[PDB]
Write a structure and sequence with these properties.
- It is classed as peptide binding protein.
- The entry lists the keywords transporter, ampg, cryo-em, permease, peptide binding protein.
- The complex is a heterotetramer.
- Chain A is mainly alpha-helical.
- Chain A has helices at 2-14, 22-30, 44-49, 56-60, 69-89, 99-124, 130-158, 162-182, 190-205, 212-229, 243-267, 272-286, 299-312, 316-324, 328-344, 349-377, 380-394, 396-403, 408-436, 442-458, 461-470, 473-482, 485-493, 495-504, 516-541, 551-581.
- In chain A, 75% of the residues lie in helices and 0% in strands.
- Chain C is mainly β.
- Chain C folds into two domains: 3-120, Immunoglobulin-like; 133-220, Immunoglobulins (Immunoglobulin-like, Sandwich), CATH 2.60.40.
- In chain C, 2% of the residues lie in helices and 39% in strands.
- Chain C has a five-stranded antiparallel sheet, with no helix packed on it. In chain C, strands 1-2-7-6 form a four-stranded antiparallel sheet, with no helix packed on it. In chain C, strands 10-11-14-13 form a four-stranded antiparallel sheet, with no helix packed on it.
- Chain D is mainly β.
- In chain D, the strands form four sheets. In chain D, strands 2, 3, 6, 7 and 8 form a five-stranded antiparallel sheet that branches. A four-stranded antiparallel sheet of chain D has the order 9-10-13-12, with no helix packed on it. In chain D, strands 1-5-4 form a three-stranded antiparallel sheet, with no helix packed on it.
- The chains are: A mainly alpha, B mainly beta, C mainly beta, D mainly beta.
- Chain A binds chain C through residues 253, 256-257, 260, 264, 267, and chain C through 55, 57, 59, 102-103.
């Protein structure tokens, strides 16, 4: 049951990607439209890169229906359906119109769906099923890409048409809407429950009609009972009946007692003494029993809280370095595999490309599924180590090919093995990412971590090209094999924190060392501001009024500053871990 | 017109199995309960199984667990009865009962020949 | 020695007033809030009233408010529910459940100990002598087979009737038939039993009938006067 | 007054199959839901409290769980003693106590074919001014059946009262009753008591009479 939900939700997250990039370009090329210089385009791609920007809204606000995750999912999906149907109805026959604008809107909705789906996956899945869920979601997303790319395009070419294709996709998205309506909802208690407590308590102060005292007090009582059993922040690790947990329970016990007293007064028809009872409740609220509370009721907290959560932990920078460079070898192989097969070896483009497509698809799916099953049967760290070693070793198939003869079977075998190991590593990586989140700020943290993982993959092109054009292909692939060692070293460095999180299920809190972590955070913030200024300058340059050459220097200066901050943070993190070891 | 289609019966080998199919053409299968009837020479017209509208309800007899099996096919609008390990006493005439009235009284106005699974 | 016994059904004016008592042995009514729950014949439960003597608090359901009044005495270790201006829909079985103090596990195990129930029925029924008789073994009915004996009645002012066979030594074979409606407004079951006739001349036919509110005990047998 | 729209609304499963009952709270109630089992003619017993916790004395067969505002009660191994009525009560405050509807599911087991028996009283009942007879389906399943009074092939309606009996806590039978009560004036038109019953377990209606 749950696995079907994961599969269909991954299908949904993968469905809307192609219509803004490939099918739209095909539609323009058929109708003799260039789709260039429209000034709204080139932002459809930028939605997916910068989807981490509007993340805090997804976890700060709880919509007044379903839950926090499911309500957002339904709103995003229905917005997507309306937008896609509108896109189908729009006819570029007269002129381009705002078609790029609608495409930008659809891209934004799809990015929001991705954020919320990742957050829900992180929230609902248990520790053992993380790998299986990641594998099934990956399977669903690849299936969505497959159906959107070729099948729908062929159907529009032969039977349905460009007019009916988008209605078909909307009709296909509807069943996933009822699926997420049927989907389970996780639990989110403390901050939200105390927020509804405070809202109804403030409503009690304005209560004058003698009837909304009772209903308000009922809401407060249900919220207090729910929040009694949840755990507060900084007490997550002291979960199994700790004295501080006992005092938490004692305070909520007294709070519910005062609520019952006020409710007893209000059932008697009194109002003024009920108001005095709520005032006494608020007075005892202010006392020292108030030890833990929530992030909301302020705008600044909705943004600042996830960052402080993540960067207050221990192992915060080593995990960052691991995420940046774990799948480097696969990126180095993929960057020029096809160029190698076309020029480095004498193979035709068409059949070889198609067979590579099929073999890579099947092999990565099989690798992901097998890794998911093995990780269900194993610990996370051991599976990560095994799969990293395997994906590092499998790259040597291409060195073997480049030195060996020109038979197709050897190339097929090497491709199959490489994509299998890639799928295994992908499943383990997504499991690690889902482990690392917080279930309170899961959306923001997961989006930031995914973008951070892609950042390391982005800058591989020029170096790979220079190496392959300078020293050759077999040397390039031996180097690519030798490049998978840093990820394994990072995995072996931080195994203690991984096993601690596997056992206690809670991340620790850093306390040692001076305020050098603050200096590193300041460096990172300065680098981010410099990157934002550079992006704004590039946006202004897009108007072609004035061009500058020092932006290249500014970008690399900002990158060096950010990387220096990250490396200093990581060395401090490792030193602290070896200090608590010693 | 109204027609009832039956199949199966005949000589059955020892230690084997059988699978019979019952359908009705010309009458709406939906919303009415389909029942099977057994009769060995020594018992009454013993019960077999009955199914209400769609899969909402289904009742089973003595010889259902381990011995018979009931399958519903929506595409072909037919019901299958499956046998196993026939005792030598299982010489059984089989009746197919379709109720034309919602009362489920068991009144049978359209007569059906019914199948006959004879053993030994 | 531990139990919670309720009493109070009896003869009152139709649409009048009546007080029920719930006396609990094994625990004091101070320590546990006492709730009265009503279940109509054939339908589900519904909470009727509660009294807490620790703080003197008292509350009633909306559909019964203003007419009932529930009190208690702790020296006599019992609670009372006085019902005035009764209506036809009021007739039901009243259970006197308990609920623990907040906080703790006593509060969470709501209504852990219950009561056997008291059938409070409101009506304008009158008094007339019923007629309870065993089935004589007449030879005409089902000749040559098993005898269909039984004990059948005609009326009872209090509906709860306790029927036992052979001083409560046997129970198997007698189908306790739920009472059917009479045009007279009363209820007359007929508990029939289908047993072989191997004990026509050896086992005597004893049927025991007990009316608890009417405090009546009847022994029924087919014997000459 | 708002419930989720569902196409399958009924269940039909046999003995030994895991069974579940669900109820949803209208608003947030926390984990304050309890599950009671009431056997016929007795006060309800506390099966589950807190929707997941259990005290001593209850078999380990029963379990409970909560998700959101949904609460579920699970029985793993169905038994002959599990056939009673089941209530979920939310008990948030003393005064805001509300009960669920209740769920009773009958007995599924190997079929004993129904037995049709006629129960006339002796003719001595006529002294009291009435004559009431019984026609009963003994040891039968499932429930759906009806009885008419084809006395001398004459239809009877109104004066025939039908009622299915449950597995009471005393005799544990399964019977269906059709009782006919007539006056002394009606005694001149009908002499032999015959009942005709139609059941799913009767391929043909059963007519039964007694001779006086």
């Amino acid at each position: 049951p749950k696995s079907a939900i994961l599969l269909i939700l991954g299908f949904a997250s993968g469905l809307p990607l192609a219509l803004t990039s490939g099918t739209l370009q095909a539609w323009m090329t058929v109708e003799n439209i260039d789709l260039k210089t429209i000034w709204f385009f080139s932002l459809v791609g930028q939605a997916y890169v910068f989807k981490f920007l509007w993340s805090p809204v997804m976890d700060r606000y709880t919509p007044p229906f379903l839950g926090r995750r499911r309500g957002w999912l339904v709103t995003t999906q229905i917005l997507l359906l309306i937008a896609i149907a509108a896109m189908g109805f729009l006819e570029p026959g007269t002129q381009l119109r705002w078609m790029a604008a609608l495409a930008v809107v659809i891209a934004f909705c799809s990015a929001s769906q991705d954020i919320v789906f990742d957050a829900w996956k992180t929230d609902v899945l248990p520790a053992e099923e993380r790998g299986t869920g990641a594998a099934i979601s990956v399977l669903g997303y690849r299936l969505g890409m497959l159906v959107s790319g070729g099948l729908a395009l062929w159907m529009a070419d032969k039977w349905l048409g460009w007019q009916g294709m988008y209605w078909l996709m909307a009709a296909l998205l509807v069943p996933c809407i009822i699926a997420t309506l049927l989907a389970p909802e996780p639990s989110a208690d403390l901050a939200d429950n105390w927020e509804t407590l405070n809202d109804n308590l403030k409503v009690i102060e304005k209560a004058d009609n003698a009837a909304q005292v009772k209903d308000a007090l009922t809401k407060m009582r249900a919220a207090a009972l729910d929040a009694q059993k949840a755990t507060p922040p900084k007490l997550e690790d002291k979960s199994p009946d700790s004295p501080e947990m006992k005092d938490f329970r004692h305070g909520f016990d007294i709070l519910v007692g005062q609520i019952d007293d006020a409710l007893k007064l209000a059932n008697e028809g009194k109002v003024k003494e009920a108001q005095a009872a709520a005032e006494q409740l608020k007075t005892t609220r202010n006392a020292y029993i108030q030890k833990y509370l929530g992030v909301p009721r302020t705008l600044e907290q909705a943004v600042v809280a996830p960052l402080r959560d993540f960067f207050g932990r221990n192992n915060a920078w080593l995990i960052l370095l691991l995420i940046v460079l774990y799948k480097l070898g696969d990126a180095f192989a993929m960057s020029l595999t096809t160029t190698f097969l076309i020029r480095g070896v004498g193979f035709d483009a068409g059949e070889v490309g198609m067979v590579n497509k099929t073999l890579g698809w099947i092999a990565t799916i099989i690798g992901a599924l097998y890794g998911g099953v093995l990780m269900q049967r194993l610990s996370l760290f051991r599976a990560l180590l095994i799969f990293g070693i395997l994906q590092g070793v499998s790259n040597a198939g291409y060195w073997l090919l480049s030195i060996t003869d020109k038979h197709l079977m050897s190339m097929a075998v090497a491709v199959f093995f490489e994509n299998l190991c890639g799928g295994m590593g992908t499943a383990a990586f997504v499991a690690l990412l889902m482990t690392l989140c917080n279930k309170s700020f899961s959306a923001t943290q997961f989006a930031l971590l995914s973008a951070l993982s892609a950042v390391g993959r982005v800058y591989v092109g020029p170096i790979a090209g220079w190496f392959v054009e300078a020293h050759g292909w077999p040397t390039f692939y031996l180097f690519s094999v030798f490049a998978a060692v840093p990820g394994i070293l990072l995995l072996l460095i931080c195994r203690k924190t991984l096993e601690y999180t596997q056992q206690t299920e809670s991340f620790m809190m850093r306390r040692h060392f001076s305020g050098a972590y603050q200096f590193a955070l300041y460096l990172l913030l300065l680098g981010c501001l410099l990157l934002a200024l550079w992006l704004i300058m590039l946006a202004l340059n897009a108007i072609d009024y004035t061009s500058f050459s020092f932006l290249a220097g500014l970008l690399e200066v900002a990158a060096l500053i950010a990387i220096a901050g990250v490396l200093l943070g990581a060395i401090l993190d490792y030193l602290a871990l070896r200090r608590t070891e010693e | 017109q109204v027609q009832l289609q039956e199949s199966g019966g005949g000589l059955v080998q020892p230690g084997g199995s059988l699978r019979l199919s019952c359908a009705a053409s010309g009458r709406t299968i939906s919303r009415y309960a389909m029942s099977w009837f057994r009769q060995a020479p020594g018992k009454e017209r013993e019960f077999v199984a009955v199914a209400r509208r769609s899969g909402d309800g289904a009742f089973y007899a003595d010889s259902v667990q381990g011995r018979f099996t009931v399958s519903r096919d929506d595409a072909k609008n037919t019901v299958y009865l499956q046998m196993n390990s026939l005792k030598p006493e299982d010489t059984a005439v089989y009746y197919c009962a379709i109720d034309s009235d919602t009362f489920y009284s068991g009144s049978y106005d359209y007569w059906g020949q019914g199948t006959q699974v004879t053993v030994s | 020695e531990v139990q919670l016994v309720e009493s109070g059904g009896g003869l009152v004016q139709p649409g009048g007033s009546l007080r029920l008592s719930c006396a609990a042995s094994g625990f004091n009514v101070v320590d546990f809030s006492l709730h009265w729950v009503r279940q109509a014949p054939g339908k589900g439960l519904e909470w009727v009233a509660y009294i807490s003597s620790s703080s003197g608090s008292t509350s009633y359901a909306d559909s019964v408010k203003g007419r009932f009044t529930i009190s208690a005495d702790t020296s006599k270790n019992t609670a009372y529910l006085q019902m005035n201006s009764l209506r036809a829909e009021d007739t039901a079985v009243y259970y006197c459940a308990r609920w623990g103090y907040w906080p703790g596990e006593p509060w969470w195990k709501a209504f852990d100990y219950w009561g056997q129930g008291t059938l409070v029925t409101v009506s304008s029924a009158s008094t007339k002598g019923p007629s309870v008789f065993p089935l004589a073994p007449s030879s005409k009915s089902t000749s040559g087979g098993t005898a269909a004996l039984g004990c059948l009645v005609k009326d009872y002012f209090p509906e709860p009737v306790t029927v036992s066979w052979n001083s409560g030594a046997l129970t198997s074979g007698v189908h306790t038939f739920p009472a059917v409606l009479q045009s007279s407004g009363l209820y007359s079951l007929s508990s029939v039993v289908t047993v072989p006739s191997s004990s026509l001349g050896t086992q005597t036919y004893i049927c025991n009938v007990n009316h608890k509110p009417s405090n009546t005990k009847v022994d029924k047998k087919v014997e000459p006067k | 007054d708002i419930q989720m729209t569902q196409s399958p609304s009924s269940l039909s499963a046999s003995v030994g199959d895991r069974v579940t009952i669900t109820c949803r709270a209208s608003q947030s109630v926390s984990s304050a839901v309890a599950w009671y089992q009431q056997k016929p003619g007795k006060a309800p017993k506390l099966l589950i409290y807190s929707a997941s916790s259990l005290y001593s004395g209850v078999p380990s067969r029963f379990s409970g769980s909560r998700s959101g505002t949904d609460f579920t009660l699970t029985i793993s191994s169905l038994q002959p003693e599990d056939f009673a009525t089941y209530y979920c009560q939310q008990y948030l405050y003393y005064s805001l106590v509300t009960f669920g509807q209740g769920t009773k599911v009958e007995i599924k087991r190997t079929v004993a074919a129904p037995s049709v028996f006629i129960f006339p009283p002796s003719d001595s009942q006529l002294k009291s001014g009435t004559a009431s007879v019984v026609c009963l389906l003994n040891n039968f399943y499932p429930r759906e059946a009806k009885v008419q009074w084809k006395v001398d092939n004459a239809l009877q309606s109104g004066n025939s009262q039908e009622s299915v009996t449950e597995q009471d806590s005393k005799d544990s039978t399964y019977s269906l009753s059709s009782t006919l009560t007539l006056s002394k004036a009606d005694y001149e038109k009908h002499k032999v008591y015959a009942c005709e019953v139609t059941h799913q377990g009767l391929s043909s209606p059963v007519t039964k009479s007694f001779n006086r």
